[PDB]
Ligand binder design. Structure first.
Ligand SMILES: [Mg+2]
Ligand SMILES: [Mg+2]
Lengths: 247, 286, 245
């Protein structure tokens, strides 16, 4: 319970591993760390109504952003990197998804679980709205599995060529992702599986923008991320994808 | 037809380009064996037509030699990427026929000048600098390779203290160095305001520091600030520092840190309206 | 037909990382599915394995897609054609001359990154590859890790950004730089390290490759990988020609 447990990792990673780069387990989430970019490749979570429920025994105010000492010093992000960068330390595995115990929540505050996110208009707003939606999905599906991670998407330039470009912050050159995704599978009461997937740009988003507009086919997230999500599920056996019936 | 690779003598280059575009440059996933054969069959049709345009004795050389030159150039450009070997072997026979028939203008102006001999490291990723350049190919009829010459050559008291003392440093240490400047900010503020009845100058200096200490607290961890700021407010109100309360603590939003000021918080978090709701005041927000 | 696994022999000094690792007959590759190029390759060279062999003919080899890679992440010849870039071997074909098949396997597009052609792939980068092969005359065994970098630059605004081209429909990343980190084992069993970073751009044929030597730890910090982590850097006799003392 209070540490990484073999049974729990296997519970969280029920539907497979998106990738195998530098995979680390905490008590209630799984993390693949991108040493080059100093942020996760991905995190993985298995949420229930119980585990996202407000718990008097969990005080988020006791939690501080801290370096992850299990990462080699060359590849650690530090508070110094984010300070006055114009970016928030943005949780990949949100602190609110992990309320079974204080330590479960504490562990989401390692800087290895962070990526630079726009604050007002994203981390603190639109992105939180998506996080809150995924937690509310537990009222529809008894078990909600979710993979969250960064993307670095190309754009076209005046020369007609395509380029990936992103800011890197601080002495440790922490990458600022262009976008983030969540790819989600809910298990209904019957044995039906339902998938949702979203891609949101790492920028100021209007507060009136519904998260539904950010829905993308999961395969396009896979192609952009260099990862395969829920590889143990044949997509022909899903019931719905982004609210749309599968054949 | 599927297995027909027709290149007409009317617009050879265009017929050639259409076959490449449709049968070789397919942006759909295809067995490389299929793509290789498709190009080999296009290449072979291109070589046949070039040979006919040059040697058939139909039409006029004015027209037909130009057609051969353009097709040869386009075909070679593809061969450098897909299949240089067949091109490299065939171009030697083509030269030999060119010279035997004494088509020396075509030899000089086209094959030599446009460098249309064997593919090599100048024009193909299938080759590198340790491979033998095809210099000898060009050394016929008084000509030399155009590249021959190239180959031979080859408040501010708080600030300054924060700037000085605040490298892989353990969290608890850096935590303490932050606390030391935090505690030192909190203690002078309490002096400025409560050594007696504070002057307008000293109320300005307290508000000055409290705004910047709050800002730094919102990044380093505002939990100490959020507890203590309530103690300061209660002392401001016991000493009747109403001017300080309204114009500084309320007006400049110097209450508990929140999603308005800090990445420790987001939307779902409760705003600290209640802190400001004293002496008739309300929170400066919403 | 040696008993211990070849992957185990090549990877003697550690794994830089463990993402999507494939073992070929005479090299090891970690594949970056996001970028459609390797993270790194590893080779173990000897005088024998880099020697000219009548039975190996590089001209018989074809650039081909790697069908062991999922379709979404597979680079294709169509991605490179008229891109302005060569299909650039990470594991060079000239390093693997014990058998035709060993050479053929370096022509998987999974072993390729986009490389400037003239002035780089075909020239200066080949010069470094030839240098690493020549090291087998000094050292009995030569271990080498080759891979891409995506290095930041600073702009007018004082900020730093990583920028790189992506080519074709499969958006194959064009690295900004490439490295080799090399360890030679001496006859006295001493270990000698070399470490180069070269820009993916036209480099003068006059430029000595020694110009591009950098401390190995700089490459590690930039790559997000650790090279030869089983060698304590105090165990090395020389690093880039200079004595460790
Ligand atoms: Mg957040
Ligand atoms: Mg090469």
């Amino acid at each position: 319970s209070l540490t990484a447990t073999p049974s729990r990792i296997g519970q969280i990673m029920k539907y497979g591993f998106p990738g195998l780069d530098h995979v680390r387990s905490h008590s209630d989430y799984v993390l693949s760390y991108d040493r080059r970019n100093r942020v996760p490749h991905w995190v993985f979570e298995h949420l229930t109504a119980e585990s996202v429920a407000k718990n008097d025994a969990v005080d988020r105010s006791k939690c501080d952003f801290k370096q992850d000492e299990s990462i080699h010093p060359f590849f650690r992000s530090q508070n110094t990197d984010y300070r006055r960068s114009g970016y928030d330390r943005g949780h990949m595995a949100a602190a609110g998804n992990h309320r079974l115990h204080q330590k479960h929540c504490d562990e989401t505050f390692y800087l290895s679980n962070m990526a630079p996110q726009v604050g007002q208009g994203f981390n603190r707003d639109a992105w939180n709205t998506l996080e809150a939606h995924v937690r509310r999905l537990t009222k529809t599906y008894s078990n909600v599995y979710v993979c969250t991670g960064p993307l670095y998407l190309p754009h076209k330039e005046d020369d007609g060529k395509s380029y990936v470009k992103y800011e890197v912050i601080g002495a440790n050159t922490v990458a600022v992702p262009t976008h983030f995704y969540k790819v989600i599978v809910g298990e209904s009461a019957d044995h039906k599986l339902h998938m949702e997937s979203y891609v949101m740009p790492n920028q100021v988003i209007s507060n009136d923008t519904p998260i539904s507009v950010f829905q993308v086919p999961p395969e396009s997230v896979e192609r952009s991320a260099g990862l395969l999500f829920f590889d143990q599920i044949n997509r022909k056996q899903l019931t719905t994808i982004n609210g749309k019936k599968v054949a | 037809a599927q297995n027909d690779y027709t290149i007409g003598l009317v617009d050879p280059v265009k017929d050639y380009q259409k076959l490449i575009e449709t049968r070789v440059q397919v942006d759909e996933i295809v067995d490389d064996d299929v793509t290789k054969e498709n190009f080999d069959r296009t290449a072979a049709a291109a070589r046949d037509v070039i040979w006919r345009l040059l040697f058939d004795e139909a039409g006029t050389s004015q027209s037909n030699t130009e057609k051969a030159s353009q097709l040869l150039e386009e075909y070679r450009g593809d061969a450098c990427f897909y299949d240089p070997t067949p091109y490299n072997e065939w171009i030697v026979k083509l030269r030999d026929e060119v010279l035997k028939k004494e088509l020396l203008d075509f030899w000089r102006d086209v094959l030599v000048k446009k460098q249309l001999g064997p593919c090599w490291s100048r024009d193909s990723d299938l080759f590198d600098s340790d491979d033998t350049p095809p210099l000898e190919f060009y050394a016929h009829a008084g000509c030399t390779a155009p590249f021959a010459a190239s180959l031979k050559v080859r408040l501010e008291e708080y600030r300054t203290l924060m700037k000085r003392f605040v490298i892989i440093v353990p969290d608890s240490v850096h935590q303490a160095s932050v606390k030391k400047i935090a505690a030192a900010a909190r203690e002078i503020i309490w002096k400025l305001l409560f050594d007696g009845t504070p002057s307008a100058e000293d109320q300005n200096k307290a508000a000055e520091l409290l705004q910047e200490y709050k800002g730094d607290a919102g990044f380093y961890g505002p939990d100490d600030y959020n507890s203590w700021i309530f103690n300061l407010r209660d002392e401001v109100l016991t000493k009747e520092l109403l001017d300080f309360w309204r114009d500084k603590m309320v007006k400049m939003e110097l209450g508990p840190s929140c999603a308005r000021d800090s990445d420790y918080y987001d939307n779902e978090d409760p705003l600290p309206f209640e802190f400001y709701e004293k002496a008739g005041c309300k929170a400066p927000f919403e």
